[PDB]
Structure 1
Amino acid sequence: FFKQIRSDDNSLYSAQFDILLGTYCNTLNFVRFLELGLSVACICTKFP
């Protein structure tokens, strides 16, 4: 690309960008079963 320019030509002062105005990520809530109400109806037992 070759481009000759006379004394102080226009189109040297070209300025225009794009912008990333942000990033929004979410996070989950961890369900603790024994902290529910439903666990009243069971006696959980660990048995390897």
Structure 2
Amino acid sequence: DVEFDALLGSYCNTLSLVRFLELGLSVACVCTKFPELAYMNEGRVQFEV
């Protein structure tokens, strides 16, 4: 007698790493890289219309 088991194949996907600038929503927002929010207390913005 011969009786064996067969792993006939293996499949995988990939985590499609979307990039936020490669995206239609990107002109809604000036996304700014400011690494110093941790030591920051507060910011303000004044407006002169």
Which bin holds the TM-score, normalised by the shorter protein?
0.5 to 0.7
Structure having the higher strand fraction is 1
Unaligned stretches of 5+ residues in structure 1? 1-13
What is the TM-score normalised by the length of structure 2?
A: 0.58
Number of aligned residue pairs: give it. Answer: 35
Structure 1 segments of 4 or more deviating over 2 A? none
Query: 1:27 — aligned with what?
Result: 14
Percent identity among equivalent residues? 77
Which is higher, the Rg of structure 1 or of structure 2? Answer: 1
Structure having the higher helix fraction is 1
